[PDB]
Every structure is written in C-alpha cells, then in structure tokens.
C-alpha cells in the first residue's frame, strides 16, 4: 500500500515504490538496464514523443527511421564522438552460427549513421536545409547502477538532426529546438528545467559546444533531460558531406543535433508526485477524468440505480466527443470508495466526478481535482458539466469551453506554479567555495556563483568542487550577463559569467 | 525520369525504380535488408501503424513496450519457436569491448520475451484478459533476396499478445484481430487479401493453429500480409503462465497473437500503382491535395499573379483548417509546370488543383483525381470548393470517390486472381500462366495434404497455400486430386 510523503531524504525510495506500485515499468526483464515498460507508463513516453513528433513537423523537421544496426566503419569514423562511445557500444558479431563479414553496433546515438546517409543525400544548396528526426531507441552497455527512465541500457527516445547551409542557420536552429523543449516541459508538462551551456571540457562528443536542460530533482540531483548540439563542420568533414553553394563552391555544410529521452517523463512524474503517488500533467494521463457512481447497488433500488448510470454515461459522452478528453467509468460496486480513490490517486488521474442519487436529485455532481483533493471538492450543476460552448477564429481554429476543461486547465496552472516554485527555490546564490558547498550537502538543487573563465581552464575548479562534496560544474548561461566589477566566487578574479553547479544524475 | 508501365513481367523492377524516385526508403545504407525509412514513405508506415495501434486502443488491447534484447535462454525454451527462428537470430555478444556473460538475441519475434512477464503478471482470473501490442523492428538475419519492405532484415511492426482464461476467449480474440486488419486493409487502404487458415504443416512455429491474409501482387505472386495465431496452451506451459480460476484451481490461459509489418504498405503501393508511379490511398498521402498556380510569371502580369497566389492560399488555408486535409502549394515559378505535373503523379498525390488566371475569371479552378488522370478533370466552382458545412465539402467528396475508385479496381483485380480448378493439370495450368491463387476442393485439412503440395511444387513451384473454413462445400463435392469426398477448398500460389 503506497503512501510516503516525496521529500529530498525520500525520493530515491518513492520513485522506485512508485514505478512498481503504479505499474509504469516492470525491472524484473533479465537484462539489466532493460525495462518493460507496462500499457500505463508506456502510453505516457508515447505520449510525450507523439508531442515531439507533432511540434518538429510544424517546424519543418520530418519524421524517418533508421536501422537499429550500425556497420563499424560507420562508427568508427569520427574520433572524438567514437571515443565518447566505444565503450557504450553492444556489438552484434554473428547471424544465426555464423560470424557477419562486418561487425554490426546496436545504436548508442545514430549521428555517424545519418550523417553517412547525409553525405549522398546532400549535393546542392538546393537540398538545404535538411532536417529529420526519429522517435526509437538507442543503446548503452556502461551504463552502471540502473534506474527506470532515469539510467537505463536501452533507451526510448526522439533524435533530430539538421543540416545547414550556414552558421547562421545552425545557430538559429538551436533556438527552434528550444522552443520544442519549452511546450514540452513546460507549456504542458508544467515544469522548469535550467538552461545551460555545458561546460566545454564536457561537451557532447563531437561537438563544437553542447546547450542543455539541467532538471533539479526532488532529491536535489539535476537531471540533463534535453541535450541540444551545434556539431559545426566537424562531422560533415569526416563524412564528407558536401554541397555546391550558389557560386557552385563546394561547402561543408553545418550539422545540428537534439534529443529527449524518458528522463522528460522522469521529470513530470517526479516533480509532481506528492504522498498518495502520482499526480499527472493532462497531456500524459491515461485517463483525465474518472466518473464514480456512488450509492449503488442498494436494496430495492434498481431504477435509481439506472438513473444514475444512465447520467454518468450522458456525462463521459459530452466529455469524449465534445472535448476530446480520455474517461473511465469505475461501476464496480464491491469496491469501497476508499479502496477505488486510493486506487485512482495512486495512478494520478487528474480529476474525478462523483455522481449520486442525492446529487442527482439537486443537480449537481462532485469534482475533484487530483491535486488539492477530497478539501477542496467543487459542486458543479450537471447541466454546467455538460455545457459546452464553440466558435471559430479568424485562423478557423476550433475553440472549445467547458467546466471540466477550465478545471483541467486550473489543475495545470497549479501544478505549473508549484513546479517553477520549486526551481526556483533550488537556485542559490554562492559568493564562496564554502557556500557552495554547504548549498550542495544541505539544500541540493544548483548552487549559482559568478566564475572568471568559460574556457577550459576551469575544470580545475570542477574537480575541487567534486573532491569537497561531489557536485560538478554543470555550465553557464551566456543570456544571462554579469553585473561589472564583480568577482570570481573562487579565485578572485574579475567574473565573467555565472556558473552552475550540482549533483547529477 | 520515371515512366515504367505496371505489369506482371515488369512489376519487381517498377517496384523497385518506385521505391527509389519516390524517395520511399533508401537501400544504399549498407547493412543488407536494412534501409532506411525516408521521410515522405515514413509517413506512409507511421500512418499505418497509428491506425493500427489506435483501433487495437478502441478494442482493449493496450500498447506496451519491451526490450529489444533477449538472452538467450529465453529464446530457447520453446522447443518448436526455436527451431523455427534459431537461424534468422542476431547475436550481440560483446558490451564494449567485453564479451557478454549471456548472450543476446535481437528479437525475431517476441513471444518467448513477452511470455515470460505475463507469467509475472498473471495470478489470478482477475488478471484476465491481458491484451497488450506494441509497435517497434524485429530482426531476422536469414532472410534472402532482399526486398524493401517485402523481404527484410530489419523489418518495422506491429505485434499483439493476449492471454486468455478460456478457449473460446482465444477463438474470439481471433476475430477481433480479423475486423482490425479488414479496417486497416480494405476500408482505409483500399486493397483484399484472401483470408486462410495456413497448411497445418507451414503453422507458426508453437502455434496451435495459423490464419492468414496472402494477397495477390501484379506479379500474380502472393505475400503473406497478416498472421493471425491460436497459440493454445503450449507457450503457458513452457514459460509457467498459470491463472487460480474462481474456484481456486490453478490452470493455464490460452495465448493468442497477430501481426502485421512493412509488406502492408508493400501491397497498398503495388496494388494502386500505374506506369505513372504511386497512386496513394488518403491514409498513407503525406500531402491530400497539391494547389498549383498556373499560367504564372508572364510579362507584364503581377497583378493577375498576385490574384492567383491569393486565392490558391485562401484554398490551401480552408481545406488545411476547416477539413483537416493536407494541402501543398507549389507556387515555385522557376520549375516548369511539366515537372511539377510529372512529380506529383509520381509521388501518388490523390488530388491536383490547378488554378490560373484565365479559370479565376470564370469563377472555376481544375480539379485532378490521380487515379483516373487529366483525361477525367473536374471543373469546379472556386465558392464550392471553399463551402464548408458530419463535415461535407466537394474536395472531400472528390477524395472519398477517388478511394472508392481504388478499392473497386483493387478489388476486382484480387477477384479475377482467384482461378477454380478442377484437376491437377487446370492447377498447373492456372498456375503458369495466369497466376495468383488457384482454388480447388480437396480431400483433407490434415498432415497427409502435404504430398500433393509436394508433387505441385514439383510440377509448377507453386505451395497449398491453405483453405478459408467459412466457404461451404458444395453436396456431393469432389477432391479435384484425389475423387475422394471434399471437406475444403484449398487455396495454391506461387510465393514471395
Ligand atoms: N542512460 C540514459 N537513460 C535515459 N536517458 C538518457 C540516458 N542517457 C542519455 N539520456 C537522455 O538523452 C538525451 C540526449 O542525449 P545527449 O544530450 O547526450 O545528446 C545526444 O545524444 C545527441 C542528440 C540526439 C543525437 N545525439 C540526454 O540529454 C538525456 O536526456
Ligand atoms: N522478412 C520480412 N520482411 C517484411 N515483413 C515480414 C517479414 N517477415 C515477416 N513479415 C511480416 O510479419 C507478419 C507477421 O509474422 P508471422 O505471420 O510469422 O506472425 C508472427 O510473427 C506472430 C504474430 C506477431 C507476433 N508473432 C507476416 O505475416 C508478414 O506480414
């Protein structure tokens, strides 16, 4: 029976509880790393994934897949990004009893791969720009102490990767990919991540420089949930990818990377996860709303009994057809009421409706949203539930109103501003090695503090900081500019950037 | 430039040439039978999938995702499903540059993978039925003579797995696959399979039974395009899928599976195509409708241009939001309109509007159905083709006649593949010349069946291929082989 209060000391234990008792994930697949993952959890990931897909294509960037399956001298290619990997690398070395002429890498990342296919797809400028992305999954063998959606062997997730006829270009797809991550995280999965230019000495293999969502967890880790790369001309080089300009000079184009993984879904879970378990974003729920016929099944009361169930029908058809919203109706009448919403709190359905004989009576219904609960219950005619208005913009976009969406769109909102809270209670300001390290061991979260180098020299200081209390220098972020005058948290000298620092995941 | 005519002796290089000037998959990525899925034919297969996944949805069978990998010991347990698949296996054996204590197989097919967690999450009645799907590739290294989408290495899916408390449940379950693929193949894509249940000698490797759908290719060849299994108990045995029953008894449930791959996009393709390219069934058209501006770029014209581009937007925009059609405007005045005219057929685009300055005068634009060609042109209303009022509209019904116009013709060619013999020799006879399925009553449903498969494979290289236990036999029937009584009509074909 799941029922354990998620603080900093807790959440270690209540996300691996969760992951079980919610039925999201299944560990017990005989290879580590490996997780099932179960109809609840899984409609989940597709559902973030889905959103990806969806808000790339409307941006231009389209949809393929690739084999799973890289030919060694593919992988090998490039030096730093093969260094970065070959340890990560499954190997496959036999078909059936015999050995393959060629060995074959599962994935760990498919940069070397499309980038090959890129090389005979790219000829012209006419063929710029180029930009695709794939939902699959990838493979890690290194990867040590395994947790669900978190650190795992294989890996769901969505990769795109665009070629570019500039810089310019390069540099302005950055920002389109971000503007990605912000719907995802934020406009619909209601939280906050911290943007970071990764520290250089710690980029993407490969890369020319790396940007990324460091994600504070309720334990006070960060997580990288989003890793988004300008790989400049370097790989476009080794894969000889080339196109004839205007002036008909052959050019190497620019090449751009991002990719989201299960960790977003780590993150919604997490952050707003509370006691009675999860406490779902609407965009990932299996089931926004759940209907429950209370008072049933009493003596001689069979044709309340039809009433009642015959309005919770009118009521999950106005809400399925009108609205688009997912709804279940639990009319199993052995159970107790307090065995279904434990149940249903367990799994984080956003809102339930009660409905009643005496209810019924006076016209009005219960609703309750998931994350207040039983306290803060609304009366709401059911006439106004079913109540639903439209009109047409001038874009003629569809514009539905109703009750049960304004209580879903309030349910957001809520669990948004808790979220951002929560960040921005996990951001520190540190004038000293010391208050950064006490902010690390007593608070977690990112300990902030203004540093005198963006270059490489810095990792000096990184290495300190993971000696004193095992944080890491995780990155700047070059929007946010330094007051003049002042000075290097740690050596002293005159600041040019504020760096974050924390423990990772 | 593509202009290959679509015939039974040229089909396997139309299909091939298509495959490739429709930028449908690329076969230079160089891992045999493993090609990359290119943008405008993922949308097809993703289109297809969705679907399928979304009326599994509608039915109670919920998606789910499982590793790729599964060791080896796994893999084995079945003695039969082994033998059947221990061939076509991918073994990854290394992490890194360390050899892997077990080794791992690339999943040919997930049954043993799947079957060992419902022995995890199943205990009681309660937990019955368990109905699970997932879309993702499975692998089989000894497919030969590779073919996109046909004959693969990496083959792109969808598997469903049920587990069931009786075996009537089982048998039912069977239907309800059966409705889904009718859906996905006939209502949507527009094309007929013969439904089978496949030669008790050629089952699924574990299955109790096999039922199928082969479709008839334009090369008169079949392609097994659905596989529907009754996996009884066996598997429950083998992997310790046991259920306590109301009363307490501990009993094993009866499994079921289906699936479905890439050879479905293969059949809408090949079956629809003409010497033009693709004709695409609206499921599987990246874009419904192409809205070209003509007559553009004259001398001394830009008013009358701007005129024209506004209008093709004013369409593009109502049937993009109102409808919710796909709609791409090709107004790139440096490409002849010869190209873009030969590019869009090609790419099977079910729908061309052409709109120009002299048409805008008369209030009309040009409405061109791919299938039947510019020969049958529609000359529609600019005010009709922008009313919108169960939403109707004429560019919608000019959609839903062009795939009711597919299905007939498809229909029709899968029916004139269906030839009835009598003998041996009419069998023979069908088989070499005319191709596609050759339907005979026979004697038996059972194992002894098999030496007339043989001596047939001998005469013509044609395979029994199975018999649909719906079709009646006729009173007082013979076998066309043996004279014995008929219990069945049997079904031959040459294979892919
Ligand atoms: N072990 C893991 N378990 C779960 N999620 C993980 C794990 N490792 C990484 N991730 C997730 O994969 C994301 C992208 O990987 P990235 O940042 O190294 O960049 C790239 O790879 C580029 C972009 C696509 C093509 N390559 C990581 O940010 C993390 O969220
Ligand atoms: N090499 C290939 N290339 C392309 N498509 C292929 C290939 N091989 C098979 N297919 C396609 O996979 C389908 C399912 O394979 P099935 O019939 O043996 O049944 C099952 O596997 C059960 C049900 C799912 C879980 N197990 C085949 O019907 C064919 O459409």
Redesign the interface.
């Known amino acids: 029976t799941f029922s354990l209060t998620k603080t900093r000391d807790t959440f270690a234990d209540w996300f691996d509880a969760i992951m079980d008792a919610a039925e999201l994930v299944?560990r017990?697949?005989?290879?580590k790393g490996?997780?099932?993952?179960?109809?609840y959890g899984?409609?989940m990931?597709?559902a973030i994934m889905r959103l990806c897909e969806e808000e790339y294509a409307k941006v231009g960037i389209?949809?393929?897949?690739?084999?799973?399956?890289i030919?060694e001298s593919?992988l090998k290619k490039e030096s730093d990004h093969i260094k970065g990997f070959?340890?990560?690398?499954?190997?496959?070395?036999?078909?059936?009893?015999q050995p393959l002429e060629?060995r074959?890498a599962?994935r760990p990342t498919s940069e070397t791969?499309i980038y090959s296919?890129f090389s005979?797809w790219v000829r012209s400028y006419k063929d710029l720009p180029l930009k695709?992305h794939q939902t699959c999954?990838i493979?890690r063998?290194?990867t040590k102490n395994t947790k669900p959606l978190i650190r795992v062997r294989?890996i769901?997730w969505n990769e795109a990767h665009c070629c570019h006829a500039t810089a310019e270009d390069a540099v302005s797809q950055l920002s389109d990919y971000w503007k990605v991550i912000d719907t995802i995280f934020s406009d619909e999965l209601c939280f906050k991540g911290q943007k970071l230019r990764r520290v250089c000495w710690d980029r993407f293999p490969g890369a020319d420089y790396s940007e990324v969502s460091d994600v504070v967890m309720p334990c006070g880790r960060v997580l990288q949930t989003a890793g988004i790369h300008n790989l400049g001309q370097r790989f476009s080089s080794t894969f000889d990818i080339l196109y004839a300009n205007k002036a008909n000079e052959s050019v190497h184009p620019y090449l751009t990377c991002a990719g989201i993984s299960t960790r977003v879904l780590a993150c919604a879970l997490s952050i707003h996860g509370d006691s009675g378990g999860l406490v779902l974003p609407p965009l990932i729920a299996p089931i926004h709303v759940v209907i429950i016929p209370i008072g049933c099944g009493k003596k001689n009361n069979q044709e309340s009994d039809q009433q009642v169930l015959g309005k919770v029908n009118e009521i999950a058809d106005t809400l399925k057809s009108k609205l688009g919203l997912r709804v279940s109706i639990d009319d199993d009448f052995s159970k107790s009421m307090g065995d279904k919403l434990y149940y249903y709190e367990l799994k984080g359905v956003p809102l339930r409706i009660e409905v009643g004989q005496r209810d019924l009576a006076n016209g009005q219904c219960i609703v309750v949203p998931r994350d207040v609960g039983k306290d803060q219950k609304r009366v709401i005619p059911i006439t106004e539930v079913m109540k639903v208005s439209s009109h047409t913009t001038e874009?003629?976009?569809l514009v539905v109103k109703n009750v049960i969406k304004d209580e879903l769109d309030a349910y957001k909102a809520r669990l948004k501003e808790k979220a951002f809270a929560f960040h921005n209670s996990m951001v520190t300001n540190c004038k000293s090695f010391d208050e950064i390290v006490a902010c690390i061991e007593n608070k977690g979260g990112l300990a902030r503090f203004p540093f005198y180098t963006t270059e490489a020299d810095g990792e000096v200081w990184d290495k300190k900081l993971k000696d004193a209390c095992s944080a890491e220098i995780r990155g700047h972020n070059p929007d946010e500019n330094v007051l003049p005058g002042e000075v290097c948290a740690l050596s002293g000298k005159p600041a040019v950037c504020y760096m974050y620092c924390a423990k990772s995941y």
């Open positions: 299944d017990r697949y005989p290879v490996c997780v099932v993952f179960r109809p899984f409609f990931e597709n389209s949809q393929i897949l690739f084999p799973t399956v030919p593919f070959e340890a990560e690398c499954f190997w496959v070395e036999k078909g059936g009893l060629e074959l599962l791969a296919m005979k695709i999954t493979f063998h290194e294989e769901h874009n003629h976009e």
